[PDB]
Design a protein around this ligand. Structure first.
Ligand SMILES: *[C@@H]1O[C@H](CO)[C@@H](O[C@@H]2O[C@H](CO)[C@@H](O)[C@H](O)[C@H]2NC(C)=O)[C@H](O)[C@H]1NC(C)=O
Ligand code: NAG
Ligand code: NAG
Ligand code: NAG
Ligand code: NAG
Lengths: 50, 98, 236
């Protein structure tokens, strides 16, 4: 028998960059007594860079 | 987190691609082992995987370059030995199967 | 009119490349030779079920609606061809009795998902399946010459988009518009459809089982041709 040596995994292209810049590069923040809520979906979150 | 289908996921890390060397693989969740090489038959531009009469995986499209690849196992072969009889001499020869 | 289905309603159920072999599957299909209803100007609410056929032949068709209450209470999906694009929105609305073309809905409630397609300025066939929060849409463009209902030509159905909405749908209605009609509906059911794939990968022909004894005979032997002689299909 021949045993395999390497192990490769390929996945589709990554292009769903989540809109997280505007959240942290925001011109204004809402007042604490009336906080603003934002929901996101269908995006890939780069938790690492944050 | 609910029972609805998920929408947000972490960035999956994509590895490299190698051929002509029997190695483990995993494409889009499809796992297995074999030898990777090009083919000639062309899928329709909405299909992945690829089967045979024995309904086992036979081809796959690499989901970054959009090209056809072929698969082949590498675990054949039984070991056999030829002996002229230990009564006379000890030199032997080895025969593999396939 | 209760016209009869003529060898239509077959779609690639899986992402495979089975080549030059026959294959049998267990999935929702349109039973061969079924009485489907002809509709020509007013359209009432039609009861949506698991699986549905649709074909028409103009550009009067604009979209579809789906939901149960249709009164901005439970989430409902809207699909419609924008005058310049295609609108894919998931926002429960207060719908009108006869929406058309902004005489569509009274008000916009909370929203979950939206999608805007690219700007989009004979017989078009549509089949919709909804399973496990996934909406599947199949279309097949076809140049035609007949001026009647479903002709005897045979064609395949290709998948377009999966919708991970995760919602529940029970009813639907067609979306049209008026400037200041011919379409059909078919209902699916679970069956045992044999499928034939050529070398290229196209479904050149298929055979239904449980239709006629000869059909079951073809079903058991996994062949489109049977030699002379007795056989044994099932038990009574
Ligand atoms: C996924 O990203 C890769 C990144 O390299 C794309 O590869 C491109 O391939 C074309 C083919 O000649 C080259 O001209 C480009 O220079 C490559 N890079 C880029 C960034 O385009 C690949 O095309 C992408 N996948 C798809 C489906 O487009
Ligand atoms: C083979 O076995 C026989 C058994 O007696 C023995 O006499 C003979 O010597 C053996 N062969 C050799 C080459 O020694
Ligand atoms: C239709 O398209 C126009 C221009 O592309 C856009 O402004 C409008 O919002 C679209 N309709 C809907 C309901 O989104
Ligand atoms: C649905 O919309 C109404 C608008 O009055 C809102 O009060 C409610 O919170 C929304 N539901 C969800 C689940 O967001
Ligand atoms: C089969 O594929 C070949 C190669 O692409 C093509 O030339 C031929 O027209 C195809 N035939 C059918 C029936 O699809």
């Amino acid at each position: 028998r021949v045993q395999p040596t390497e192990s490769i995994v390929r996945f589709p292209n990554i292009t769903n960059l989540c809109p997280f810049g505007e959240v942290f590069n925001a011109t204004r923040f809402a007042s604490v007594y009336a906080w603003n809520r934002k929901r996101i979906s269908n995006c890939v979150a780069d938790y690492s860079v944050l | 987190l609910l029972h609805a289908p998920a929408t947000v996921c972490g960035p999956k890390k994509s590895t490299n691609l190698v051929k002509n060397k029997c190695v483990n693989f995993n494409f889009n969740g499809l796992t297995g082992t074999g030898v990777l090489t090009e083919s000639n038959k062309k899928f329709l531009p909405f299909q992945q995987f690829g089967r045979d009469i024995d309904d086992t995986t036979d081809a796959v499209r690499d989901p970054q370059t959009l090209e056809i690849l072929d698969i082949t196992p590498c675990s054949f072969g039984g070991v056999s030995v030829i002996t002229p009889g230990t009564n006379t001499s000890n030199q032997v020869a080895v025969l593999y199967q396939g | 009119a209760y016209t009869n289905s003529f060898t239509r309603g077959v779609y690639y159920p899986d992402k495979v490349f089975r080549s030059s072999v026959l294959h049998s599957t267990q999935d929702l299909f349109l039973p061969f030779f079924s009485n489907v209803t002809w509709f020509h100007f007013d359209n009432p609410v039609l009861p949506f079920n698991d699986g549905v056929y649709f074909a028409s032949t103009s550009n009067i068709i604009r979209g579809w609606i789906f939901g149960t209450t249709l009164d901005s209470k439970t989430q409902s999906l809207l699909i419609v061809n924008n005058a310049t694009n295609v609108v894919i929105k998931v926002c429960e609305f207060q719908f009108c009795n006869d929406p058309f073309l902004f005489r569509v809905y009274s008000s916009a409630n909370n929203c979950t998902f939206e999608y805007v397609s690219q700007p989009f300025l004979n017989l078009r066939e549509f089949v919709f399946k909804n399973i496990d929060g996934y909406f599947k849409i199949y279309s097949k463009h076809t140049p035609i010459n007949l001026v009647r209902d479903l002709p005897q030509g045979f064609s395949a159905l290709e998948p377009l988009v999966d919708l991970p909405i995760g919602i529940n749908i029970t009813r639907f209605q067609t979306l049209l518009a008026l400037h200041r009609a011919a379409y059909y509906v078919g209902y699916l059911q679970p069956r045992t459809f044999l499928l034939k794939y050529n070398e290229n990968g196209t479904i050149t022909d298929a055979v239904d089982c449980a239709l006629d004894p000869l059909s079951e005979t073809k079903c058991t032997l996994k062949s489109f041709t049977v030699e002379k002689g007795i056989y044994q299909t099932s038990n009574f």
